[PDB]
Design a protein around this ligand. Structure first.
Ligand SMILES: CC[C@@]1(O)CCN(c2ccc(F)cn2)C1
Length: 185
């Protein structure tokens, strides 16, 4: 791909974070804490899962960013509607306003309903996310493998403003404490 020149500076929105997350001072890194992080509850926070949104809202144009997933066992990445459900249980699907891929139990899958098997020969340490709002496209690129395509959602019904979406995953195993990091342009 040649999408790097629509690069946008993404930062994380503390107010949307699950109350166990720790966001860095620069708002470019997030990890799971070993406890509640001593913040008040609010209607924006994802309650059930270790999720957080980007601060940026997009309703037009082409946007690209990169995320470091080094030494994680589990994570979700992509974009979602600004109006997604925050509280209780839900599935990551375009019907619920999410365009995502994930790693879980040594397999990579796209968040369709039901989920789609991905075929990645080189396990990625960094993921590129490309959104074309007018075209209705969300694409995922393997930066570790010369930018090779991972998955494309097309004919997307965004149905409102979009926000960058992140899930650092649980750490039941003690093997998933590593952060998600937004990579420099
Ligand atoms: C274990 C120390 C941390 O809590 C802080 C930094 N960290 C990692 C782990 C892996 C990796 F690739 C990058 N950062 C997790």
């Amino acid at each position: 791909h040649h999408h790097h020149h629509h690069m946008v500076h993404i930062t994380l929105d503390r107010n949307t974070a699950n109350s166990w997350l720790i966001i860095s001072k620069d708002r470019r890194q997030v990890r799971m804490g070993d406890t509640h992080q001593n913040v008040s509850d609010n209607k924006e926070r994802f309650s059930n899962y270790p999720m957080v949104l980007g601060a940026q809202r997009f309703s037009s144009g082409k946007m690209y960013w990169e995320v470091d997933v080094t030494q994680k066992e589990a994570w979700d990445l992509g974009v979602c509607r600004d109006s997604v459900q925050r509280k209780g249980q839900f599935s990551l699907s375009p019907e619920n306003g999410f365009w995502t891929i994930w790693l879980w139990q040594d397999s990579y899958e796209a968040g369709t309903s039901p989920q789609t098997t991905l075929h990645i020969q080189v396990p990625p340490c960094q993921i590129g996310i490309f959104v074309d709002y007018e075209a209705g496209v969300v694409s995922f690129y393997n930066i570790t493998d010369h930018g090779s395509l991972i998955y494309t959602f097309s004919e997307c019904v965004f149905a409102g403003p979009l926000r960058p979406f992140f899930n650092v995953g649980f750490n039941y195993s003690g093997g998933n404490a590593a952060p998600l990091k937004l990579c420099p342009l």
